[PDB]
């Protein structure tokens, strides 16, 4: 068979490496020398801690990882391609800093689009990421943003996560809707931020070809409601994520989760303080309030991605070969 992806050396970063390092933090450790790191990549409108303090920072620590995260400024609202420089740099650093050992990446919302962008276009990290555990990823963007012609002034990453954007087009045409490392995608038909998610099929924004694609309603029934934040914080998500992180295959396993795990409330192993914070988690909507970059057209694609979106309109014009 065949699966094609970009090849060669990694494209150059627009940000200096010191600036990208400044966006990476590990709890209790230095990225230069870390035991069993996991890289956490946050959603639009949030920092690492705002997305994960109430959930996978303590949960991954109790599973024996050192939690590390990136907080691309300002609040993941800048150009998704620049947010991805933070992720690629972080994988490079943490892979070296754990002894040249592959490490897992765990994400929410835009974070997963960033992880898959980096894996598609930065070949050096494909052998450095052990597995990807993505919660409500928007690999096709979301139809609840926009539409394409109604985006004036919006932050850069909001233009880019609108359905039909040049960025989501380039990702798809370059082969990035197929999993590149073992990947598990946990998402919900009742996500109020990322749609469409209702088909349990490759139409869903969270779906990756050959991924372990887990729509909550496929397991727990069509009347099982779990919202965007709940997709990250629930006991169901914890059982699936724990299975993915420990699996000998790199993906969650059906033998490990099932209807006995269909609990949409905050993960059982969180403290009561943590469950309260998780159940109240409003981070997905932080981008409605925070000050972002001003952007009057969809950000241009970097040269490594531009050839995959011929005919789409960005700041410079309509992409050609």
Numbering used by the authors: -3 to 317
Sentences from the study reporting this entry:
Here, we choose lipase B from Candida antarctica (CALB), as the model enzyme, in which Asp187-His224-Ser105 is the catalytically active triad. Lipases function according to the classical Ser-His-Asp catalytic triad mechanism. In the present study we propose that the Ser → Cys conversion in lipases may lead to high activity by accurate manipulation of the local environment surrounding the hybrid Cys-His-Asp triad, enabled by laboratory evolution. We succeed in evolving cysteine-CALB mutants that are even more active than WT CALB.
In order to gain insight into the basis of increased activities of QW4 and QW10, the crystal structures of both enzymes were solved and refined to 1.85 and 1.88 Å resolution, respectively. Surprisingly, Cys105 in variant QW4 appeared to be oxidized to the respective sulfinic acid. Directed evolution of cysteine-CALB with generation of mutant QW4 led to a distinct improvement of activity for a range of bulky substrates, which are not well accepted by WT CALB. The raised mobility of loop 137–150 in QW4 and QW10 enables ready entry of bulky substrates, which can be attributed to the introduction of the V149G mutation. Interestingly, the nucleophile exchange (S105C) in QW4 results in a conformational change of helix 277–288, compared with QW10 or WT. While the helixes of QW10 and WT CALB are well superimposable, the helix section P280-Y282 of QW4 is deformed and shifted toward the active site, with an additional H-bond between Y281 and E188 formed. This conformational change also induces loop 289–294 next to helix 277–288 to shift by about 3.8 Å towards the solvent.
